[PDB]
Amino acid sequence: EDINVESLTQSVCDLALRFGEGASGEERLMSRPFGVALLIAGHDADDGYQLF
Amino acid sequence: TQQPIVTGTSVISMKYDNGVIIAADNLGSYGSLLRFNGVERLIPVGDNTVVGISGDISDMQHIERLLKDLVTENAYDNPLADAEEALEPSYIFEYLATVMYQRRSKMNPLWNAIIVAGVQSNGDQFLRYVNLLGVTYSSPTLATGFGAHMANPLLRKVVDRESDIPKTTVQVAEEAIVNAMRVLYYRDARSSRNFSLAIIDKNTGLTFKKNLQVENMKWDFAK
Amino acid sequence: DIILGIRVQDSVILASSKAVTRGISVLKDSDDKTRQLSPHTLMSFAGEAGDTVQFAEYIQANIQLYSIREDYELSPQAVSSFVRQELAKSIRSRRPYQVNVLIGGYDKKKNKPELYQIDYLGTKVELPYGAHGYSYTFFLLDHHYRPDMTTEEGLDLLKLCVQELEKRMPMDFKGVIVKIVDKDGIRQVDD
Amino acid sequence: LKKGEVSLGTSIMAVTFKDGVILGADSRTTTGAYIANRVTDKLTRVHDKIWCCRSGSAADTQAIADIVQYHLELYTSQYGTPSTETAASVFKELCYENKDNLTAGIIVAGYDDKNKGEVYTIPLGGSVHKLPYAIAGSGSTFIYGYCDKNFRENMSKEETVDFIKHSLSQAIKWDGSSGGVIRMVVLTAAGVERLIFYPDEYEQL
Amino acid sequence: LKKGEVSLGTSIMAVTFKDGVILGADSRTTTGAYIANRVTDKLTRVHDKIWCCRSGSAADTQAIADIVQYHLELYTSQYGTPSTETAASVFKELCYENKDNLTAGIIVAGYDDKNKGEVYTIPLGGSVHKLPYAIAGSGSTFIYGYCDKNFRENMSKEETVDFIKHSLSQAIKWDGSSGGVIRMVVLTAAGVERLIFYPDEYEQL
Amino acid sequence: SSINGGIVVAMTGKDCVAIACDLRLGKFEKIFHYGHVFLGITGLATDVTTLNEMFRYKTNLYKLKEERAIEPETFTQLVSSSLYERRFGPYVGPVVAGINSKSGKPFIAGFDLIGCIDEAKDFIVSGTASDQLFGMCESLYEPNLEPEDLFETISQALLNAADRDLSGWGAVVYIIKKDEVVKRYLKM
Amino acid sequence: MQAIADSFSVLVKELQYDNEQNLESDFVTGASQFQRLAPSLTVPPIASPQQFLRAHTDDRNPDCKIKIAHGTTTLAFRFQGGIIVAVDSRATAGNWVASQTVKKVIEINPFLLGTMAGGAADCQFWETWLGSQCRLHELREKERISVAAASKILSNLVYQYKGAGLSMGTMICGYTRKEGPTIYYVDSDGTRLKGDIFCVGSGQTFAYGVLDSNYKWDLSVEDALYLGKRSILAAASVNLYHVTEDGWIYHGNH
Amino acid sequence: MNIVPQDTFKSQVSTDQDKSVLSSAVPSLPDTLRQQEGGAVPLSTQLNDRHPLESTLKNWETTQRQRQMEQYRQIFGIAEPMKRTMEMEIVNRTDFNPLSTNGSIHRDILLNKECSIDWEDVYPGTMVGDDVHSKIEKQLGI
Amino acid sequence: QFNPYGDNGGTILGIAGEDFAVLAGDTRNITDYSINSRYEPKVFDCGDNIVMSANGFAADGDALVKRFKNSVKWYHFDHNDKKLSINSAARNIQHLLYGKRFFPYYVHTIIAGLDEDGKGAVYSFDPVGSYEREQCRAGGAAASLIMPFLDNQVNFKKPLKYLSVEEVIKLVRDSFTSATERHIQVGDGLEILIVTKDGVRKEFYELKRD
Amino acid sequence: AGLSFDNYQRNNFLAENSHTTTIVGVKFNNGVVIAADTRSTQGPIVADKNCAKLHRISPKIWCAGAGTAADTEAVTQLIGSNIELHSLYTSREPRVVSALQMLKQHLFKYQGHIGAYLIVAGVDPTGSHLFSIHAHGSTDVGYYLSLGSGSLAAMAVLESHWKQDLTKEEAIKLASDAIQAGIWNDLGSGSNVDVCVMEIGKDAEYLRNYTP
């Protein structure tokens, strides 16, 4: 099935959280936080068209 | 391991209208040699749970150690361990079944058959069976080894189905258990005359009886 | 899986049979039992399916990497030694698999052709001629081999060997892909 | 032994005393771990005062006992009451000539006017040994030292009865193939006497 | 048991009496039918008043005994004299956690001012049992009944010495792998005492 | 030329019997008669032929001596004894069907390879698989059927068995009454 | 130092839940088991896993046996402008009722197809995995993956588990702009062949003979479809697939 | 409290179990070229036909070290194993010698093997890799 | 060599209607020629109107059901309590089964529910993972005694589409009674779970062993 | 003559090439009762739901068997023929001891290759007798015996409710209860119960489907 846009956005944010402790308790992965902002545009059956 | 070395024979358990009754004999046999007399194979966990284990004695002692560790960890750090925060028989059985299946999947099983009996907080009787393969099942009457072939029909004559549970008093269940133990001592070569009994009742609590002997032996029909 | 290699005074001729699979009907025009290690070094292999092709492609990748890194072409002797070492290393901690390798090259520094054979255990031997597969033909090669034979004489001998092999084979022996390695490089004979 | 064949995991004790002989045994027949019969009469009567106990294959021992009883009936039809030595010789010949196909072991207890009661043992293989007393079976291995320490020559009847009772009680206690009741046959000049003891009697010794 | 090893076929006994404990054994080490060592000290010491006897595989038992002595030295450095229960627990853990690789069985005898002498047995598999007396080895099977008929609680030192001597003499007599001399260690409040009995003394019993 | 194995089904109707056997098409039938008794044998072809010849021999001698045709029960006992004779060298699955000439009751029975008799009041299935065909027969069987209804039932069972595993599949069906025997072929 | 202290601080050991893999596989700490691009396969912790699996896979419930794709005749050939893939739709008897025809052909992508000719579960699982890999490659490179690349990926994957117990033989057929129409055969033994005509199944010599009788490069779509149908019938309900540069098109019998 | 090592067998396998050597074109598959093992070595072959003593010898000093730590925890407390492990980890992590494989003197002093020799000490025992940069990447995790 | 597998018998049956699904199973757990339990359910409600049943080795089936339920719980946690479809559940079960390819579960699995359109859907899984959607499937050591009964008393081409839930329940009960009469393993009870848009309903019938 | 050994080598060659119940007896104060279940199964499948497992050697000597069905039936029939001929020759009522001797000798002759395990009950002028016979030629004497796959439940029931002095009705009830327990608790036992009661001086009473 297609992944919900909010689920993908949450996954990307969990990746961005890797300069510290991860959501599931993983150790640090990167020395500094990211320097990128993202606009994620999607469509799913549950919530129609979404922009995050 | 690959095979039991010192082994227990049978544990038999029944449900009655107010609780559960379990029993097992005290013997550890070294092959065909009846070696150790005075082996307690019923483990009282909490104030309402009894675990009966049949099979390898070393694995039984390992399971006893696990149960003691679980009881000790339950009080860490609950100040209400004796209160409503005690261990239900369902928790203990779930833990034991998980352990048995995990060890079976690791090709290093515990050669045991385990029957967990008790009374829940709401008063519901609990009676479950697990084995070295992790196979679990429930029934108003349970038994292991030769008890599963001889004592089981005798117990099922009393508690035939779920509707017969409220009709069975504690005296009837205890008498049936004693008779089944006598039959097992009659027709099992690895059995023992001495056995222990445990009654878990939602009103009177836990009653543990030790040093019970098979009586009313019929041997006069010889000559 | 039958492979042959004949070394003549000025070149090396390598012949390989069409690869077939049990119970599978395939029609193609390709040489999947031969890899070009270098513009003047060719390799033919025969053995168990899967492992042999992986080993051949691994060897080809390593040799191409060396050629790119050094901007130079390895000699056939060095190529054969590297193949022998890698083959011995492959079965270092596993059950050995059936594989036989014929390596034919033309050393430019010595300006002469060379041919080597390596078996499944990793035994490298330099030969004037070699074959693998059916176990018949060594007598025919022995009676009709000269160190100073030309390319045409070697091709005639190879044709005779192919005909002899086809006669014994129950008419299931398809064509033979023939390649020649010499000073001009590696070419394929469509005759 | 053959696959699926019944084996005689018994406890047998024959003791010679001042007035004759006593042969005792248990009464359990097993199928590995399930007790097929709680009460069995392992004391086989071959002649009026010549009894035996069997070990090994049940079928082979029963066939041998039947043939020996037939042979002793034939002998009695000619020369009267036989002797324990003759019965032991017949048992030994049958067991030794057939040891390649039959697994059998016998303990023979007899009485006669000439010899005044004797015990013979024929283990697996077919060799006959004459002993003051003999023990056999799976449980017999647990009472070797006890019997060795507590045996005397020319004991009285009650002393021999007590000795056999204690030894068989220990053998039953330590062995899983030994059963409830103890059966003893006393062969003396007066006649043949049969005694039976129950678990509630000897377990309290 | 791995092929080609050495098996500790022996006669091990440990008896608790009024003033402490006594641990006894034979001195025979055999490899098949050949007596490899007819003078063997099988009374392994793991602490000043904690001794043990080993059975199964010699190498595994020696390694376990060395590790247990190391553990008890650490404990003594930290907390002082350990009790026999602690040594038995260490033995049981070592035997149980390696039961898929090592075959070992131990009999542990000990003494302390509180418990006043104790006997523990760890058979093959790793289980532990506390008994008033223990017997083990290939030659033990012949004295079981005897040991069940002559043991009394709170015996004097001489009575225990005689009981162990008689039982081990019978086990030596009836077992092919048991022989030589009898070695006994007496653990009481006074100290550790060594006793050795020669064949010419116990064979006349 | 492999002809080893097959399926034979026997059913009892109101006052009749039906015995059917599978064929192979692409001359070798597995049903034989010795008067008013029918026998179907499944298994090794050589054993089938040997049993057919031996039973023809014995039935001919029985008719010559007794001066009457043999009854299905007596033939069942004879087949059982003959099978038990080769106790250590046993041959197959035999099925016996018929109607007694005096009482008129239908009779069907089956045998193992050492002559153990299984007398079935409903139906007998003999064959290698004996799982799909057995289930189809169990679902399709109704007691006390007319000869036409019984024939339809057994033909439907055979067709259903054939459908669930061919080009050269056929069947032979015998509908046996007290006074008439009808033989039919099924070509799927 | 805190982790070191916690390691030597005291049930979880018996449950084997101190290991990351056990917690992940039992879905204790999250749904990370269903997030692995390369799946993890359980192996018995014994010295002989392969012999164990081989012994236990030949022992007797019919429902609890590993399903094997039937050795039906499968054919594939590339004539001028596509690939014709022909299969026979002859169902096998069983204790079930099918709501549709048996899917003897796996649709990897709108542009790739594969055949089972082996173990059903292995083929389905690994061809779905190959489709995911091809989709990821196309997302990364912004271009359709070559058929050679997909066949090589599948071959490497099945070679990494060579001898473990996998049994699958597939035909990857695809039409790309750079290469044209290409057919590869990938076996569970690591074999990887490239061909113009492929015939497999219980009977394929007759189909190959029929093809060789009437095969040429200068064919047409209708002629190639008729040739494939005739070959399948002669080898004996003929499902056809025509693969062009725009994708594959399915025909029940036409 | 183990004498012979236990649980040396793998429970799960995958194509990306070796995280250090993975392909870049297909990250879910291993990189055969950079493995430099022979080119025809599937991972499954490592699960069968191994010498029984190889696992025992490969993990033997680790088992004794773990048993010693368990004994210290049982007799001394958490602090003693914690300190021993902390010292050993500090010593191991500080050292980085890409041109040598022999252990440091301080590691042997902590392990109490200053005057001890085994066959590992006597016998300490390409186109791609085995250079300084690969070891730097492995050490730093980049 | 320790044998990690076993067998507990039992029979299950899954049928798909036009707006409902039915999954039934005999409630008897038995070892070799002995009755462990006369009532041990093998069909469970695994979340969002999905019924699942694994027949064969009991421990493997319990483990698979437990893992699937935990996966569903984490799926609800991750995606805003989104309802899990029957096809997604089928693929999840396929991955769970194939994750043990070299140490397989000794079970045959059947799940039932409603598809996106609202029709009944039944999926069948072999022990290693291969699955397909079927109108009717019988598993266990009674399928050869149940499938011909259904094929005789109904057609899947009375068409199955026009059947109601009561008729399907009656057919299942009759087939299981016939199997109980013919087969020793089958008996002692029959539990049926019916999945409709209103949810999951449970019914129980007593067979001929008490 | 006798049982044939032909095609033994052929059968072995084919095999190498891939070419392939509850019974109780209870002795009461004036006779013996033998009871059995009535289900015949060809494995998982129930072949017959009402089968007579009580076979008759003599008008007052009955038996029930297990093991190989064909061997049991053949041996019982042969011993019955021998017993009838012996009774005609001696003009006396046959004895259970004679049948026991014939069965024992015949089974020992074949060295266990004839698989038939029997419970034999009977009444003769010397009294009532009950024996158990093993396939290798060993026989045992008892007061209550059980046989078959459901013999453990039957033995439990018999041990529960057995006394020295039992009447006919009590013995019949005990045998019926033992067979019922075997039927309920064992998968291989089912259906009805067949009983045969033999007293001293009275005809044998054979009750088929005593409890349905």
Swiss-Prot record, chains D, E:
Name any one GO molecular function: endopeptidase activity
Q: Which residues does the Swiss-Prot or TrEMBL record annotate as the active site?
A: T10
Disulfide pattern: none
Subcellular location(s): the record lists:
Cytoplasm; Nucleus
Any one biological process term the GO annotation gives: proteasome-mediated ubiquitin-dependent protein catabolic process
The reply to whether Protease figures as a keyword in the UniProt entry is yes
* Pfam families reported for this sequence: Proteasome
Question: Looking at the UniProt record for this protein, which Gene Ontology cellular component terms does it annotate, in alphabetical order?
Answer: cytosol; nucleus; proteasome complex; proteasome core complex, beta-subunit complex; proteasome storage granule
Query: What UniProt keywords apply to this chain's record, in alphabetical order?
Result: Acetylation, Cytoplasm, Hydrolase, Nucleus, Protease, Proteasome, Threonine protease, Zymogen
Chief localization:
cytoplasm
Quote the SUPFAM superfamilies the UniProt record gives. N-terminal nucleophile aminohydrolases (Ntn hydrolases)
Catalysed reactions, semicolon-separated: Cleavage of peptide bonds with very broad specificity
- Entry keyword Nucleus: yes
Read off the CDD domains from this record: proteasome_beta_type_6
Tell me which EC number(s) this protein carries: 3.4.25.1
Q: What does this protein do?
A: The proteasome degrades poly-ubiquitinated proteins in the cytoplasm and in the nucleus. It is essential for the regulated turnover of proteins and for the removal of misfolded proteins. The proteasome is a multicatalytic proteinase complex that is characterized by its ability to cleave peptides with Arg, Phe, Tyr, Leu, and Glu adjacent to the leaving group at neutral or slightly basic pH. It has an ATP-dependent proteolytic activity. PRE3 and PRE4 are necessary for the peptidyl-glutamyl-peptide-hydrolyzing activity. This subunit is necessary for the peptidylglutamyl-peptide hydrolyzing activity.
UniProt lists the family membership as follows:
Belongs to the peptidase T1B family.
Extra facts: The side chain of Thr-10 acts as a nucleophile, and the N-terminal amino group acts as a proton acceptor.
Curated annotation (Swiss-Prot), chain F:
Main location class: cytoplasm
Q: Which GO terms describe its cellular component?
A: cytosol; nucleus; proteasome complex; proteasome core complex, beta-subunit complex
Q: Does the keyword Phosphoprotein apply?
A: yes
Q: Which CDD domains does the record associate with it?
A: proteasome_beta_type_3 (cd03759)
Tell me the residues linked by Glycyl lysine isopeptide (Lys-Gly) (interchain with G-Cter in ubiquitin): K58
For biological process, the GO terms are: proteasomal ubiquitin-independent protein catabolic process; proteasome-mediated ubiquitin-dependent protein catabolic process
| Alphabetical list of Pfam families matching this protein | Proteasome
Gene Ontology molecular function terms on file: endopeptidase activator activity
Q: Which UniProt keywords apply?
A: Cytoplasm, Isopeptide bond, Nucleus, Phosphoprotein, Proteasome, Ubl conjugation
- Tell me where in or outside the cell this protein is found: Cytoplasm; Nucleus
- Quaternary context: The 26S proteasome consists of a 20S proteasome core and two 19S regulatory subunits. The 20S proteasome core is composed of 28 subunits that are arranged in four stacked rings, resulting in a barrel-shaped structure. The two end rings are each formed by seven alpha subunits, and the two central rings are each formed by seven beta subunits. The catalytic chamber with the active sites is on the inside of the barrel.
Family per similarity comment: Belongs to the peptidase T1B family.
Q: What is this protein called?
A: Proteasome subunit beta type-3
Which organism was this protein described from?
Saccharomyces cerevisiae (strain ATCC 204508 / S288c) (Baker's yeast)
From Swiss-Prot, chain H:
Q: What's any GO biological process attached to this entry?
A: DNA damage response
InterPro entries reported for this sequence? Ump1
Span list, region Disordered: 1-35
| A GO CC annotation given for this chain | nucleus
Its PTM note reads: Seems to be degraded by the proteasome upon its formation.
Stretches of Polar residues bias are at 8-26
Q: Which residues form a coiled coil?
A: none
Q: Which Pfam families match?
A: UMP1
Q: What are the UniProt keywords, alphabetically?
A: Chaperone
Q: What does this protein do?
A: Short-lived chaperone present in the precursor form of the 20S proteasome and absent in the mature complex. Required for the correct assembly and enzymatic activation of the proteasome. Also prevents premature processing of the PRE2 propeptide.
Family membership noted in the UniProt record: Belongs to the POMP/UMP1 family.
What other note does the entry give for this protein?
A: Present with 2740 molecules/cell in log phase SD medium.
Q: What is this protein called?
A: Proteasome maturation factor UMP1
From Swiss-Prot, chain I:
According to its UniProt entry, the function of this protein is described as:
Non-catalytic component of the proteasome which degrades poly-ubiquitinated proteins in the cytoplasm and in the nucleus. It is essential for the regulated turnover of proteins and for the removal of misfolded proteins. The proteasome is a multicatalytic proteinase complex that is characterized by its ability to cleave peptides with Arg, Phe, Tyr, Leu, and Glu adjacent to the leaving group at neutral or slightly basic pH. It has an ATP-dependent proteolytic activity.
Assembly and oligomerization: The 26S proteasome consists of a 20S proteasome core and two 19S regulatory subunits. The 20S proteasome core is composed of 28 subunits that are arranged in four stacked rings, resulting in a barrel-shaped structure. The two end rings are each formed by seven alpha subunits, and the two central rings are each formed by seven beta subunits. The catalytic chamber with the active sites is on the inside of the barrel.
The entry's protein name is Proteasome subunit beta type-6
Q: Which gene encodes it?
A: PRE7
InterPro entries the UniProt entry points to: Ntn_hydrolases_N (IPR029055), Proteasome_bsu_CS (IPR016050), Proteasome_sua/b (IPR001353), Proteasome_suB-type (IPR023333)
- Presence of keyword Nucleus: yes
User: Per UniProt, what is one Pfam family of this protein?
Assistant: Proteasome
Family note: Belongs to the peptidase T1B family.
Q: Please provide, in alphabetical order, the Gene Ontology terms of the cellular component aspect for this entry.
A: cytosol; nucleus; proteasome complex; proteasome core complex, beta-subunit complex
UniProt-listed CDD domains: proteasome_beta_type_1 (cd03757)
Does the UniProt entry include the keyword Ribosomal protein? no
Give the record's keywords alphabetically: Cytoplasm, Nucleus, Proteasome
Q: Which domain of life is it from?
A: Eukaryota
